[model samples]
Target: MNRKVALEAVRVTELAALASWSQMGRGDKIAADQAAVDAMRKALNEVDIDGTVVIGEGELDEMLYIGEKVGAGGCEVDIALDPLEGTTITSKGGANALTVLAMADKGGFLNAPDVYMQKIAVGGINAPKGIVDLDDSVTNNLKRIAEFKGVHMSALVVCTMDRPRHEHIIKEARECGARVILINDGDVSGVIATATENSGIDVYIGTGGAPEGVLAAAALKCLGGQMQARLIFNDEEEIKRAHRLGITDLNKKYDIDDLASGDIVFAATGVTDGNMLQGVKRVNSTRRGSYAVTHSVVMRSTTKTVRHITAEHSFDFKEGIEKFMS
Candidate 1:
């Protein structure tokens, strides 16, 4: 009974992915995002922990807003939720859209301010602990990775989100004779690729959401991957926000443990087909009834036990299932 909440946490992601799948491919991601948020928010209340959402979508006017309390009753826990991790990809019916969440004991997760984070990550066991640093140059990081992996730099594959802001990063990575892979969305999955099986990515370097940076760190911790991230701000208001959150040092580099510690649980269910997990699929659908299948991954830090759950849910199989669209 050490991690009874393990399945409970994945259930929350499964329902959220199912709900969001109901709205996929309509070209209106806001609707899909709302469905995911609604399902995740409602499902969290059914769990056994007195959970507080520390890193949610918003500070105000967001359903799972930061500080929102959920769950039926049990131990206190901290939650970092991205009800719909790739709203844009979902809208376009692309890959890697997911319902992602992480949980830990209260105060175990760094309540990261809403800002941008620059991160460099690799497989924990594949390289040394200090293999890469946020303070290091891009070439130095790649050189170190190649050195430790005992491969030529040209054979190294680095990945990140495909944003115009990353032009320089991609150029530098290429200039250093390292291969680069660019994803359209879901950097959480992008970062997780470091330790994923069959994923050729050797490094992940990019600037992404601070909250998601913590979530990515949580997942990497479970997979025995190493990641280092430091907050970067484009707006003056961002610094003030971090200050309010007790972040006195704006340039602090956070290792995986610094972001999330103590019996962490990371769960993600794909809302659309992706490299990590398959998208939710409807086996049969009619106005009368339907069955939906969900693919998910859940991990616990204590045992590093990762479970790949593939569930088929019948719309009429249980009561209170009406929350999901039929």
Candidate 2:
């Protein structure tokens, strides 16, 4: 909600990452996800705020249901979280699995309905407003971005999910001579990776869940990146659901601020190694009590600061995650 809550947000993600770390490569996604859900719920309840789960649940069988209340109580806030973003991929030992969380004061987060969102993100500097848009053709967007950054399209790289649905977009990017990074899952980090200097991702484009779209927008909002999304409503029922969430514009184009505004805090701890952060590492497990080291990045809109934290958690001395760990 506020700037100070940024550190608190990182703590919640770190705990979730540690508690769920054991499930990595275990080949049981539901078990991996449940561990994170348990840890995140426990840690969030201990935070100092009155928080509601605004964008959660129903993704990867995510447990933090929408509208669910959390925290110990203080400032009213809305939370959008994916306790274990790459659940299946993490279970399979893939990269970019993370424990992600975002928070804002009441009405600061969008209550995006359960639907697909067409999203495009360009990270880091040289990213001016209107540099890219969802409605723009991928080829034109790529050309515009490349020219704005003063680079040839062939020298640029685009990131997208490896889903069948993204075939068209991927083809467009390549036809424009831009390289592509097709991730198996976790578009939240895919979008955020573009902002890192050496991430090799010039832009990220694809259709992903609305929940993660809002979560990614929070990070872009903090990192001074650019993003735009439009909900992909499939049926009349989906449209009705959008209306229920106060979204009167059925075909609205949502800029970064439209998805998440006010004092936004975005934090993510890696459960599996990737460009953005490293996964948890347990050292000296047999000889003595081991420690879990986690990599995380916490950012806030108010300060526009991105803090990368490599934390060592003494599992032997910690009590908060005992009940949740495997």
CA lDDT of each prediction against the hidden true structure: 0.85, 0.85
Question: Per-candidate TM vs. native?
Answer: 0.92, 0.92
**lDDT for model 2, on a 0 to 1 scale?**
0.85
- Summing lDDT over every window of 10 consecutive residues in candidate 1, give the lowest-scoring window: 317-326
Across residues 1-326, which tens digit of lDDT does each residue of candidate 2 receive? 54567799899999889877878888998888898898899999888888988887665355688878999987888999888888897889898888999998888877788899999999865578788898789998999889877898899989899999999998888887999878888898898888876877889999998988999899888887899999998999989999987888888999988999988899999998876778988654665576788989998888888899988766654544344373
Could you give candidate 1's per-residue lDDT for residues 1-326 as a string of tens digits?
23778889899999899888877887887788888888998889999888898988975644899888999888888898899888888889987888998998888888888888999899765566678897788999999888887899999999988899899889999998999998888888888878888777888999998888898888988888788989997788988998898898999999888998888999999888876788987676565476788999999888999899999887654444335741
Runs in model 1 lying further than 4 Å from the true structure: 284-290, 315-323
Inter-residue clash pairs, candidate 2:
none
